[PDB]
Amino acid sequence: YSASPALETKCAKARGAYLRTHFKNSREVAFTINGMSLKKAFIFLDNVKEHKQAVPFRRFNGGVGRTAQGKEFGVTQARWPVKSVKFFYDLLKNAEANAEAKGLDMDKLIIKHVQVNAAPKQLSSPSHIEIIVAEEESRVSLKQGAKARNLAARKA
Amino acid sequence: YRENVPKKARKAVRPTKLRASLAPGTVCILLAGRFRGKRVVVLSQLEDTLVVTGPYKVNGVPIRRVNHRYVIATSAPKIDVSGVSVEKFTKAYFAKQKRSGPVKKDEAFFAENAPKNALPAERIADQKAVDAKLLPAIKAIPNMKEYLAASFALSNGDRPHLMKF
Amino acid sequence: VNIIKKRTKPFKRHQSDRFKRVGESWRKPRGIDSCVRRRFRGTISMPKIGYGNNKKTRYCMPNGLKAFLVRNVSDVELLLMHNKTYAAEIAGNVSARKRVEIVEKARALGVKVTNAGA
Amino acid sequence: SEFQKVVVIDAKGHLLGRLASVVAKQLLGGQKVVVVRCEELNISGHFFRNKLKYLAYLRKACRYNPSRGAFHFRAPSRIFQKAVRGMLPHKTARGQAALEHLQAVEGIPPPFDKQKRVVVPAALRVLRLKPGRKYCTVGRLSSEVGWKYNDIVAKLEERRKVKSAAFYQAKLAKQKKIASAKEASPVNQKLSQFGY
Amino acid sequence: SLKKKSKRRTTRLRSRIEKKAAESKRKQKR
Amino acid sequence: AQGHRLYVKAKHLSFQRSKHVIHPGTSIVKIEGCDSKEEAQFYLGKRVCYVYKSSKAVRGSKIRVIWGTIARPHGNSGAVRARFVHNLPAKTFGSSLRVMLYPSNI
RNA sequence: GAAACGGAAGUGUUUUAUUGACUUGUCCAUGAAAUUCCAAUCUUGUGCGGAAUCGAAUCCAUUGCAUACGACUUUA
RNA sequence: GCGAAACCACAGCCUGGGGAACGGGCCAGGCAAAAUCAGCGGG
RNA sequence: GAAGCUCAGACGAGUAGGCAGGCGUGGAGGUUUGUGACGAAGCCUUGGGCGUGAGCCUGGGUCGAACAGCCUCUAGU
RNA sequence: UCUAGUGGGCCAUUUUUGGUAAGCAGAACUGGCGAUGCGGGAUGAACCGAACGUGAGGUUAAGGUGCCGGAAUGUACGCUC
RNA sequence: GUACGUGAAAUUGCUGAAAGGGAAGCAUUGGAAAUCAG
To answer: How is chain F split into domains, by residue range?
Structure first.
């Protein structure tokens, strides 16, 4: 994968390729849900699916409508792409299952790494998606040294 | 193969011409080293340096070589030097010991020498002999023992290019 | 005799940084109106014969030794009479066994090896 | 000639550009400068002439969205700061940093009225302008083009002078006492041969 | 400025002032 | 504690320059207390010093020093020219330098 | 350990009694050295084992005096 | 939710001056604080 | 390395154009007991070195089968 | 003896006949510019100096020394509100 | 790993570092941080 983590010590992995979702919306959802606790991310995705929270649009923010639900992230522009969230929800189900398989502690899991890459254009622009969940945790010169020696004797 | 023999350079060695006011028996300020700002009496005129000391009973500056470029020859009244011999101070007399290698360090190298062990008793005999032969002169003229005990330092509004030391 | 380099920065080609198609290698500006060809103030400099280094210190490493490319044991064996002038350079495509063989031979001859740490 | 950390200049009787040129040189020299009592700065030329010089400054304003246009500061401290800023390369980081080392205030605030105030003889009106030559004060010239704090600053200056005079009377009483004791000592004339 | 015009003569004026001075001198010579 | 300062305070003004060219080879030093060239002859040849502080601590000592020498008087108003081993950075215009009283000749 | 005063930005000033120093005003004794020719204040810091400390805002909802959406005025 | 293309040296505040064509870059100034949403299309 | 060594002096912008010496590429003849699965060529590189320059040598990583120096010939260079 | 490239124009000076409100036109000559960077004149095809290998140091030209800006808020004598 | 030898650039995403008040890029001189070299 992309990052030096995914060591089997305290990690679990999941990925998706050629997922039929827009690249830019998937990127914005990935950026937002990065670093959150795993169970915390789930309800947040449930909130976005049910319009009780919105994912900020930061890089691909062209023409987004301003909403009051983008206030928690400090931005003025927010949107609720539900297709990409459903793709992310399924991916997190699989990553959660892989965590079960390896045998971690699921209560303290965090989204350590998530990255969306462009896929062979087929037109739509598919997106490769990958998720990592894991756990948290001179010298002394002759004159300088001689002065150090004299001051050492001075204190005593 | 080649080992290019250096051409016979036509450079010789002549005695260094010290300044006019750097005569033996004068009082000068010390500008560098561990004793910067001290005032010390010049005993003898060496090849390049000045064999100079503050009376060790007065300020505690032992007999040292000092290069003449880091000396300000004050116009303080001269102290006689004919009463003390100065031939025993040579360049080899002041020189370091060998080193036996390019690198030596560590605090054990610091607990050695010090002003007790590698310091010979003959040096104190010379140092006390100098003090015996200069204290009567420094005592004769007023403020002199107090002048040498003090330290030289600049003040705000003190411009050295106008100060006549 | 200390080695002296008149210039250290290489002569980059004009606009070799604003384009990925124009390369770093130096090319002489041909245009009649080129402000670089007419050598205006502040414009980049052009290679000239005046930057040539001293013939006595030319082609010398920072330690005063000229590089000689060595591919087998025979090459270094030819360097025994110039251990003071030429330092051996093991070619990139020399196998591991030959490298240790050459480097041990070069040590025996007492000839400098620049990349013996391989 | 010798630098301090901060210099507080009493700007009464100094010419605008003559003082601003020296201050411009000292700021780039790397020294913090505080200019006090700006509302008594002087400018050559009679008052009506300079009033026209400043009312032409009021005419410069961008025709589109005048909030973008030039801002014509009226306070005497701000007029002096305009002189210095134009005498600095403010379009850089070293020119910008020179302004940050300059303080210009009208009157002498309590943070500075307890420190010595030096003057700049290269800019003093009595040493530069020929007698009989018309001149105008910046403090008057501001109170006629918009600055609306002339009277209060004059009011506070009057109180400050009263307090400062009372301090000086106390300091003179002490100083005359020690001077009596200064001359009383005999060692004075056994060091008189050294000129002290 | 302070004036009703600009004191810095634009380079056209710096251009044609001298030549028209030259034509004036030629006229006196004729 | 005023038994120190065996140096003379000075300031770095600019590089030796024309209006559109600078030569960082030599730096223009304003030795405070010197107000003409005949006075600047005294400090001609002294050891000038620029003292600054950094982030990394070498020698366990927080102070780095760039040595230099007074070379020539520069103008009428008592400024001098100085040659530092490393040309002073342009961020040090107005920074304070030290002028050691050595190599002494007085 | 206390009094007085300072509002222009009070960046403090002063009165103090106190303690403990220090104590060149003046004269003496000890010690510096082979660093043997130049190269105190400033706060985080991170914790120390002992003290005490117990707030708000937004989303969700509501209002309509406001409103393209934000925002704004309320309620909760 | 789906989702283009034209176009693209690089960019985008203003006044005066730069022989011309005076300009968006030069000079001298005015100045200059992220991210944006909707109108008017002035340029 | 007579195509070599050495000493001395002056000189140094440059369009069309004139002249000289070099760098690089594919293939051919000759030579180097030439390099190579104990890793050729290629590719990457905040690694190092050389040349005024065209360019060249090398460290580390990736890679997996061929490749280069010299003297000449040649050109879809 | 043979053999490439060029056969324009602009700017200013000096002459110079026709000339008119006024410019304007006419020739001949000169240099500079095309191939030319550098210092200065705020900036500039022609103004003032200066004809260029890589550097160090020293000294100047033109132009400057209040500040921007390196360099005397120099000295002396006047004029000007 | 059949979207299969080598896998370049343009181009995109993530992490780390740094900079940014109406551009940037480039050059000379050094400072700082990283990293080498004799």
So the answer is: 1-106
Nearest Cα neighbor of B44 from B18, B75, B13 is: B18
Resolution in A: 3.2
CA dist B69 and F101 (Å) reads 9
Please tell me which of the candidates B72, B151, B162 has its beta carbon nearest to residue F101: B72
3-class DSSP string for chain D: CCCCCEEEEECCCEEHHHHHHHHHHHHHCCCEEEEECHHHCEEECCHHHHHHHHHHHCCCCCCCCCCCCCCCCCCHHHHHHHHHHHCCCCCCHHHHHHHCCEEECCCCCCCCCCCCCECCCCCEHHHHCCCCCCEEEHHHHHCCCCCCCHHHHHHHHHHHHHHHHHHHHHHHHHHHHHHHHHHHCHHHHHCHHHCC
D60 and D115 housed in the same domain: yes
**B129, amino acid identity:** A
Q: Does A147 touch chain F (CB under 8 A)?
A: no
**Alpha-carbon separation of residue D98 from A111, D150, F55, F78 (angstroms):** 49, 28, 25, 23
Residue D145 and residue D143: Cα distance in Å, rounded? 6
β-strand partners of A89: none
Tell me if D113 sits within 8 A of D164, measured CB to CB.
yes
Buried/exposed code over D130-149 (b: 16+ C-beta within 10 A; e: otherwise): eeeeeebbbbbbbbeeebeb
Which residue's entry shows tokens 């997106």?
Answer: A127
DSSP class of residue C22 equals S
Same domain? D141 vs D82: yes
Give the span between the Cα atoms of B49 and B61, in whole angstroms. Answer: 16
Q: Report d(CA B123, CA D72) in Å as an integer.
A: 79
Rounded CA-CA distance F96/D191 in Å is 38
Please name the residue of chain D whose CA is at the shortest distance from the CA of residue E1: D56
Token pair in block for residue D111: 């943070």
Which of left, alpha, beta for F45 (phi over 0: left; psi -120 to 50: alpha)?
A: left
Across the interface, whether the CB atoms of F95 and D1 are under 8 A apart is answered no
Residue whose structure tokens are 């030596």: B104
Instruction: Please tell me the total count of domains within chain D.
Output: 2
Phi and psi at residue C33, in whole multiples of 5°? -95, 5
Q: Which of C45, D94, C41 is nearest to F21 (CA)?
A: C41
Method by which this entry was solved? cryo-EM
Enumerate residues 6+ apart whose C-beta is below 8 A from A36.
Answer: A44, A110, A111
Q: Which nucleotide is nearest to D71 (CA to C1')?
A: H30
Same domain assignment for residues D145 and D160? no
Nearest CA to C59 out of C87, C79, C80 is that of: C87
Same domain, D56 and D68: yes
Nearest to A142 by CA among B161, D123, B107: B107
Residue type, B58: V
Q: Which candidate, F64, B64, B106, places its Cα nearest to that of A145?
A: B106
What DSSP string describes C68-112?
EEE-SHHHHHTTGGGTTTEEEEE-TT--HHHHHHHHHHHHHHT--
Distances (CA, A) of B86 to B25, B51, B127, C71: 12, 9, 12, 69
Amino acid type, C104: E
Q: Domain coordinates of chain B in residue numbers?
A: 1-165
Closest residue by Cα to residue A28 from A72, A80, A91, A90: A80
Nucleotide minimizing C1' to CA distance for residue E15: H19
What range does the domain containing D161 cover? Answer: 151-196
For residue F103, cis peptide bond before it (omega within 30 degrees of 0) = yes
Is the same domain home to D120 and D42? yes
Which positions of strand I lie within 7 Å of protein CB atoms?
Answer: 12-13, 15, 32-41, 47, 49-55, 57-60
Q: How many CA atoms are closer than 13 Å to the CA of D10, on its beta-carbon side?
A: 11
DSSP SS3 for A83 = helix
**CA dist C20 to C13, C15, C17, C24, C44, Å?**
12, 10, 7, 9, 19
Residue written as token pair 């009312």: D55
Domain locations in chain A as residue ranges = 1-156
